[PDB]
Amino acid sequence: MEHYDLAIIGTGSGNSIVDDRYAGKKVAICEQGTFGGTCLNVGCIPTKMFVYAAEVAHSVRTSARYGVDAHIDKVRWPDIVERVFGRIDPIAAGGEDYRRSDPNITVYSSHTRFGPKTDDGRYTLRTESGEEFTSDQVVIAAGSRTYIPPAVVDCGVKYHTSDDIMRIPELPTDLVIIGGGFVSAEFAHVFSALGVHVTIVVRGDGLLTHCDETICHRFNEIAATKWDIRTHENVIGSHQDGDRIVLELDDGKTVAADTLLVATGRVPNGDLLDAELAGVEVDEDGRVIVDQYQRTTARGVFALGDVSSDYQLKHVANHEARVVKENLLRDWDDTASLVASDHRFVPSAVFTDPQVATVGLTEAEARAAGHDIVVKVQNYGDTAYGWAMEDTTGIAKLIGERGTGKLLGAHILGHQASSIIQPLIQAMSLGQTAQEIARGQYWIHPALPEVIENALLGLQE
Amino acid sequence: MEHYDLAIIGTGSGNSIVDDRYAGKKVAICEQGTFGGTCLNVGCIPTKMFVYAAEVAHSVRTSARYGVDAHIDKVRWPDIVERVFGRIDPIAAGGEDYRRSDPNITVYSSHTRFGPKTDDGRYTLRTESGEEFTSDQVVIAAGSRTYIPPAVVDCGVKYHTSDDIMRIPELPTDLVIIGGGFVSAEFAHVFSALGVHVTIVVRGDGLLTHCDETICHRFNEIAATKWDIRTHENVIGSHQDGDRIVLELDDGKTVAADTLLVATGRVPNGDLLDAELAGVEVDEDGRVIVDQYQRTTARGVFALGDVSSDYQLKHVANHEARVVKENLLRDWDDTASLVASDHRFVPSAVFTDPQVATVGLTEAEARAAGHDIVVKVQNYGDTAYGWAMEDTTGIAKLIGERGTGKLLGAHILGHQASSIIQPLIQAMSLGQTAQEIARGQYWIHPALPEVIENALLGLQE
């Protein structure tokens, strides 16, 4: 019989768990699909890669705006796909040899359930891969999986999410997109920059109704002038009609396009473990119960982001991986000095046209929290940039508590959003105020971040 | 003869100093070139404006690397120039009435100069503009003035600096550029992106020998391949030969090109004021002497910016104007509440191909300060930005003191250098330690600012 000291499933951040410290144990990291979890092969890392191809293919489109003329000539879609996913296929087969070919660890193939605890209290793990093995401690990453509404299970039309549409063999002539959220808004810009009309069919009223209000506003009012935005219009079902896919719409007006897309949201993958038997709560989501220290209800076993966090992102996953790989040594005894995850302020970034990056709380949140607010919206304009790009619609909305000047969540759309929210992230996370950032440091001028200046300067303080 | 409560020489930042507070006094100003100083009319706002047109004209050139095809098609040089200077011609004569006619002030013309103090100790100021008036306090902005070596008085060939080469009627077919002193080599990229061979002729050894050593190195060793870089070889004399100008070199290398450029450096403007009579020392440079509080040697009179400071930039000029506009009221008595400028770290940004941004001290300087250092080189590469863009040549130099994990100057070159040094600028200003900044906050994954991540992570701590 085989038995390890520590086990892992997903390796989004689960490959970061293996460190020194242990260095002399038996470890298994049974990964089911490509080593890297959801991070490198399907989720965060593989995205944002096509984005630069799209950004060049968009700057050529907008070249006329800057006294420049440029032609698309030809689109090397095969070369773009091989440049993106020809980079992460051998590297994927690299973090796997880390824990297969190399000694004190051994990894197997897909499937990793849970089994009844042994009489001596150890954790049982089951592969449907003709094998069963127990261990002492097992941490679960198991990434996340995109979710398709029943409209696809009533037909069988070929569907694509973030998992596969980046490796589609051909560039469509006309594309359908459904979903208003994180996973769906990137491909709209990414593809439309490469010469395809996309047809957005959401389930609410507009795109991404779970972000900033005064950012949803001016993202709707630029997405309308590029993509076909159908509002509610709940897709009732689909029926293929030869070539060209046609979905049936809530108001009868059936919509047609070449290729399909879905990705309305994600769900964690804790259910597939049947942890109900091993005394672990999963709670419908797949989220798997944890706490501050990512500690579940069973001993020695833990979980990480996506599968468990309240943010399905890799930075929170890395902090949770930090506390996981650290807490298997500072035993569950001392709830102090056991090191807890940072589940305060986190940034989210959706790279579309234009980019968007948010952090902290929105106006609705702080108004529901009872504080009086000094919100400002700085136009990507009055800076010495703005006019250099003829940027008319880019904005950075910054929220701060009055009296003291405590910034509480920024929301920026326009050129350079992620590398502009980062000063605001730094100020947010560790006891920085607002004026401090404003007139306590130089802003190079005419550097891009100058917006923050007029974003912070004009506040109450 | 007249006497005012406040006088000014130049309104580069002089339009911002008179900022309420007084609101009910008599104020006089003196403009020689154009109301608005060098920022709005010649310096910061321009130069960097054409840069985005050039950067689009460079992304088209590099599109081939990313499975993209794009054409140079057309350069709308007249439309670019009118798009640039259609912003600073009416606004210059708009922000000027802001501080000249309305609502209780009077400003005069021509170059002004100090005159002998009156018997009651008041400052006399002389405009060659027929009229003369004195005052009680006078601030000197006088920006900075471009400097041409004697190399031009031995020829008479048409020469261009930052003042005018952006408003040249046509775009040359082959261009020569001289000057390596002040951070001038922006126009090299700006023009070469628009289809003209530029010929750099320095006076030292390489381009801009007053920057970081291991950055001058890897910037010269890409500028050699993109632009025609002629090393040292002091031109001295010149002789124009029709359209294409040919300079005669001491070593025989006659250089040829259509249009010329002259950006070897700038010098402060204290000499032309003959302020020597009104008791203010004009040091060797021609500069205006001040100190922490921007306090010169005569009372009530002050100076700010490049005309007096040791930094020829507009952000430091605006901070010095910030302290100035307040210190004209808090008399020299309380030197503790007379408030001082922040003259530690200052950021510089040179917008070329690619951009570059520096802050604090370089490695040589910090070695001259006696600290043992934990320098890191991030390489701008294995991060997800360079991983998606095949970014090979961008770099980030981070300097830090050992033991505690301090910091002594960041230096970043690449696509996004100005808007990435700003988190590092904020970290510099207020005692954040490398350890704190690294994993004490979230950094968006996958996103450009991840470059800072492994720049801080891969350290002694």
Numbering used by the authors:
A (entry chain A), B (entry chain B): 1 to 461
Question: Any passages from the paper?
Answer:
Two structures of Mtrs from homologous Actinobacteria are presented in this work; Mtr Ms from the M. tuberculosis model organism M. smegmatis and Mtr Re from R. erythropolis, a biocatalyst used for the bioremediation of toxic compounds. In addition, a strongly comparable A 465 nm/A 280 nm ratio for both proteins, as well as the yellow crystals obtained of Mtr Re and Mtr Ms , support the presence of FAD in both proteins, although FAD could not be built into the Mtr Ms structure due to its low resolution and lack of significant density. Together, these results demonstrate that the detailed structural features observed and described for the structure of Mtr Re are representative of both Mtr Re and Mtr Ms , as well as other Mtrs across species. In contrast to the previously reported asymmetric SAXS structure of Mtr, the crystallographic Mtr structures from M. smegmatis and R. erythropolis presented in this work display a symmetrical topology, as described for most homologous oxidoreductase structures.
The NADPH-dependent FAD-containing oxidoreductase mycothiol disulfide reductase (Mtr) is known to reduce oxidized mycothiol disulfide (MSSM) to MSH, which is crucial to maintain the cellular redox balance. Mtr belongs to a group of NAD(P)H-dependent homodimeric oxidoreductases with a tightly bound flavin adenine dinucleotide (FAD) cofactor per subunit. The crystal structures of Mtr Re and Mtr Ms confirm that Mtr is a homodimer, as also supported by molecular-weight estimations during protein purification. Each monomer, composed of 458 and 461 residues in Mtr Re and Mtr Ms , respectively, belongs to the pyridine nucleotide-disulfide oxidoreductase (PNDO) superfamily and consists of three domains, namely a NAD(P)H-binding domain, a FAD-binding domain and a dimerization/interface domain. In addition, each subunit contains a catalytic redox-active disulfide/Cys pair that is responsible for the reduction of their respective and structurally unique disulfide-bonded substrates.
